[PDB]
Design a protein around this ligand. Structure first.
Ligand SMILES: *[C@@H]1O[C@H](CO)[C@@H](O[C@@H]2O[C@H](CO)[C@@H](O[C@@H]3O[C@H](CO)[C@@H](O)[C@H](O)[C@@H]3O)[C@H](O)[C@H]2NC(C)=O)[C@H](O)[C@H]1NC(C)=O
Ligand SMILES: *[C@@H]1O[C@H](CO)[C@@H](O[C@@H]2O[C@H](CO)[C@@H](O)[C@H](O)[C@H]2NC(C)=O)[C@H](O)[C@H]1NC(C)=O
Ligand SMILES: *[C@@H]1O[C@H](CO)[C@@H](O)[C@H](O)[C@H]1NC(C)=O
Ligand SMILES: *[C@@H]1O[C@H](CO)[C@@H](O)[C@H](O)[C@H]1NC(C)=O
Ligand SMILES: *[C@@H]1O[C@H](CO)[C@@H](O)[C@H](O)[C@H]1NC(C)=O
Ligand SMILES: *[C@@H]1O[C@H](CO)[C@@H](O)[C@H](O)[C@H]1NC(C)=O
Ligand SMILES: *[C@@H]1O[C@H](CO)[C@@H](O)[C@H](O)[C@H]1NC(C)=O
Lengths: 375, 379
């Protein structure tokens, strides 16, 4: 039988990469049982036009799965949404390979959606692990007010209360907002000397500047950030020594496609060796009923282990997100990022470098100067 | 101007034709003259096609929705559209009544229903007015249960009773599953009252596994939130007698009445704008052509549209777009397999109608426990 899968991509050269990859996947384990195919589209500015183009894509093929990417990012957020609403209506399991917003994890809204890169929320595991290794125990948190920020709060809290540490003075600030020095001053009389930022590339630029007046960037203070917190219009303004971090090979946009078709195909075979798999509905217009076996196909696709992953071992969690990824720590010396370690799945392993803390010192500055004066 | 969308039916077109002429139907002070649209076969194909193409033929100012129940995916689409064209919208129906928790950052969906929390906050009153005070919770693995499960443990803490909860279950109840494993977890149970949360297609699978494990007799009583129940009127088989579920106030009404209750809101909101801000806020919404960079003025009309009282009711919404403090009712399944209003919940104090829950039996003939008596005093 002819099994058809489609995808939405950006450049039309990655489309040819995808076709070559599905071919090499055919010649890998294929046989006379069932063959595969491919179909591709490109983005458009008005998302509504994209939803209609996706119904055209869908009427043109009894699609079994979709892939989506957002290489051009005038809106890093609203690019992969319309395909998700348009396909989830029929439980058509859509894979997303490059998008990091945290809203697409709440499964009550997007009925079916998966990923091959963990989101910004899963980031705080390495923060807590660094806290355990280096023995820091009094931390100030600093988070924005939109959902993508609010997630990290709950994450860190549930991760800390398992040991009853209860970090102190979580400060919020509205997004796109200038003049945050009204806030930092409240975090000026506090005992803890290690801040943890999580914001957008437009906001982080501000607070880096707003600190330059308060002069907390000086010696003795140490702080660490997240991926989006550097590498933007903000990195020009960063104070040196901020131990931020990054992904192993994200933004590649080509290695993933070789991974997805590998975990998609290894499932379609594991599925069709079973009961009624009838068909997905051919045509947006003229039908109002869901593919009666969508959930099964997502049920199986959840636990499909994959071995030879160009990115590495790929597997999914209970919500749907690549578990056990790689993060590569950084450190900002003389306005250039230089690696200082590697975060592998569960623990951290540094090597062959001396960390440069912000003030220029060369010894691990512990926080918590116990304030002598008293109120 | 106002628009109306029919998105589901058995042919009511006599009611559709009825709404064609009445450009003078309402008494609300504005140009209520409504246009109209129709929909066959609701799906993302047509539903997108129609309702911005219409936005080109007029500038209406807003839409009003209605459809049939048991379709859930159509809830997001409407939110998606209202995110681009920047036009307020209002849903009064079954399908899109269930409340979406996070709405897009700049949308104006204005749903018409109640949350999960504001239903558990009513069950946990009835549950104690007869102080059963001991229950078990059963939930399938349906999207959004982890939200619900946090409902009970939180509410059970901001109250003043022991609330001795025995246990919690979780079990796959779709069309395909091992009934024995669920039979294992079910038959191994002992509790007076059960609070269950499942979809309707889930329900008949559950309540059928009930009888064979002996969990349906007058020795038990069930509570399920607004979701599990049927359309409203024809309850299927296998729903035990003596069900309890809370339902918003418009529970029993005519579809032609709701719409008049619908357009009233936009009307009372509009006329209230002219009195304070002045002269009919700019009504306009554009489809695909260059939509919605930012909204400096319509977003100021949004706030007027929140608080709005009419005909002696309060309809004040919360930023999450679900009603705050509506006058809810309770309903139950008597021995004629209908639904009968059992008790109103008006303005913070739960009234009732039965000073003791009549507990039925296998074949009607309502059983009264012998040891219970009625005492009559005065002051
Ligand atoms: C296997 O994959 C191929 C590749 O997509 C499938 O075929 C292609 O078939 C569609 C259906 O007719 C063609 O599309 C239509 O294309 C015209 C071209 O202008 C367009 O105007 C229409 O709006 C409509 O979309 C498409 O052109 C054609 N591919 C190419 C390169 O010409 C094929 O159906 C798949 N078969 C199986 C068994 O999987
Ligand atoms: C109900 O809504 C109205 C309208 O949003 C509120 O009145 C507004 O109050 C703000 C702040 O004072 C003013 O800038 C607006 O001009 C007012 N609008 C109107 C219609 O006068 C009102 O405060 C809300 N609360 C109540 C109880 O009515
Ligand atoms: C706004 O910035 C100025 C800098 O000139 C500062 O003096 C002022 O305190 C800030 N506003 C608040 C509310 O702190
Ligand atoms: C930095 O600290 C404060 C501003 O917070 C300022 O008064 C002080 O003079 C500055 N000191 C130096 C060495 O820049
Ligand atoms: C992306 O990944 C592939 C395979 O891991 C690698 O060969 C390639 O150099 C990477 N970068 C680009 C730009 O393709
Ligand atoms: C990624 O993680 C694996 C698992 O330990 C590790 O072997 C590898 O060196 C890491 N880095 C890569 C693949 O670039
Ligand atoms: C990560 O590296 C450490 C180094 O000792 C090793 O013990 C551990 O097994 C590795 N775990 C992963 C994620 O492969």
């Amino acid at each position: 039988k002819i099994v058809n899968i489609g995808a939405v991509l950006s450049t039309r050269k990655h489309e040819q990469m995808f076709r070559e990859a599905v071919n090499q996947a055919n010649k890998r384990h294929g046989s006379w049982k069932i063959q595969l195919n491919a179909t591709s589209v490109t983005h458009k500015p008005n998302a509504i036009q994209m939803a209609l183009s996706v119904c055209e894509d869908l009427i043109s093929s009894q699609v079994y799965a979709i892939l989506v990417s957002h290489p051009p990012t005038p809106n890093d957020h609203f690019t992969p949404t319309p395909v998700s609403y348009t396909a989830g209506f029929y439980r058509i399991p859509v894979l997303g390979l490059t998008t990091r917003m945290s809203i697409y994890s709440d499964k009550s809204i997007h009925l079916s959606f998966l990923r091959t890169v963990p989101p910004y929320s899963h980031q705080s595991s390495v923060w807590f692990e660094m806290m355990r290794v280096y023995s820091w125990n009094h931390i100030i948190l600093l988070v924005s007010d939109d959902h993508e920020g609010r997630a990290a709060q709950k994450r860190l809290e549930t991760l800390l209360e398992e040991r009853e540490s209860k970090a102190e003075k979580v400060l919020q600030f509205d997004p796109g907002t200038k003049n945050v020095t009204a806030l930092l001053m409240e975090a000026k009389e506090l005992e803890a000397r290690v801040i943890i930022l999580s914001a957008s590339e437009d906001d982080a630029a501000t607070v880096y500047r707003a600190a330059a007046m308060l002069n907390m960037t000086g010696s003795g203070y140490v702080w660490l950030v997240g991926e989006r917190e550097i590498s933007g219009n903000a990195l020009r303004y960063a104070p040196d020594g901020i131990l931020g971090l990054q992904l192993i090979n994200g933004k590649n946009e080509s290695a993933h496609i070789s991974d997805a078709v590998g975990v998609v195909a290894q499932a379609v075979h594991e599925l069709l060796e079973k009961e009624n798999i009838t068909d997905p509905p051919r045509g947006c217009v003229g039908n109002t009923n869901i593919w009666k076996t969508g959930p099964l196909f997502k049920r199986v696709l959840m636990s499909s282990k994959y071995a030879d992953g160009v990115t590495g071992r790929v597997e999914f969690n209970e919500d749907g997100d690549r578990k056990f990824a790689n993060y590569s720590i950084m450190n900002l010396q003389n306005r250039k990022l230089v690696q200082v370690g590697i975060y592998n799945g569960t623990h951290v392993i540094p090597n062959d470098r001396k960390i440069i803390w912000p003030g220029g010192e060369t010894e691990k500055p512990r926080g918590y100067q116990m304030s002598t004066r008293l109120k | 101007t106002v628009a109306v969308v029919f998105s589901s039916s058995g042919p009511p077109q006599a009611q559709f034709r009825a709404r064609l002429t009445p450009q003078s139907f309402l008494d609300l002070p504005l140009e209520i003259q409504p246009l109209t649209v129709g929909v066959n076969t609701t799906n993302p194909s047509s539903l997108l096609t129609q309702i911005c193409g219409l936005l080109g033929a007029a500038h209406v100012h807003g839409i009003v929705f209605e459809d049939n129940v048991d379709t859930e995916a159509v809830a997001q689409i409407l939110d998606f559209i209202s995110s681009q064209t920047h036009v307020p919208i209002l849903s009064i129906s079954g399908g899109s009544a269930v409340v979406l928790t996070p709405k897009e950052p700049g949308s104006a969906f204005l749903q018409l229903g109640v949350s999960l929390e504001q239903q558990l906050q009513v069950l946990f009153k009835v549950l104690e007015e007869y102080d059963w005070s001991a229950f078990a919770v059963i939930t399938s693995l349906h999207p959004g249960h982890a939200l619900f499960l946090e409902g009970v443990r939180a509410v059970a803490d901001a109250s003043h009773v022991s609330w001795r909860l025995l246990d919690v279950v979780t079990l796959e109840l779709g069309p395909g599953g091992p009934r024995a494993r669920t039979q294992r977890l079910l038959r191994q149970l002992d509790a007076p009252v059960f609070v269950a949360y499942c979809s309707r297609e889930e329900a008949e699978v559950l309540f059928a596994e009930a009888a064979q494990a002996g969990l349906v007799g007058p020795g038990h009583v069930w509570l399920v939130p607004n979701l599990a129940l049927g359309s409203t009127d024809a309850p299927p088989a296998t729903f035990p007698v003596g069900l309890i579920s809370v339902v918003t106030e418009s529970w029993r009404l005519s579809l032609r009445q709701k719409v008049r209750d619908g357009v009233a809101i936009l009307a009372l909101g509009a006329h209230s704008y002219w009195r304070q801000h002045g002269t009919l806020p700019a009504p306009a919404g554009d489809c695909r052509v260059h939509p919605g960079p930012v909204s400096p003025a319509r977003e100021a009309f949004y706030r007027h549209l929140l608080n709005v009282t009419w005909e002696g009711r309060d309809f004040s919404f919360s930023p999450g777009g679900y009603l705050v403090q509506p006058t809810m009712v309770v309903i139950a399944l008597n021995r004629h397999r209908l639904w009968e209003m059992v008790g109103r919940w008006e303005h913070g104090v739960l009234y009732m109608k039965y000073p003791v829950w009549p507990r039925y039996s296998a074949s009607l003939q309502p059983v009264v426990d012998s040891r219970h008596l009625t005492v009559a005093t005065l002051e």
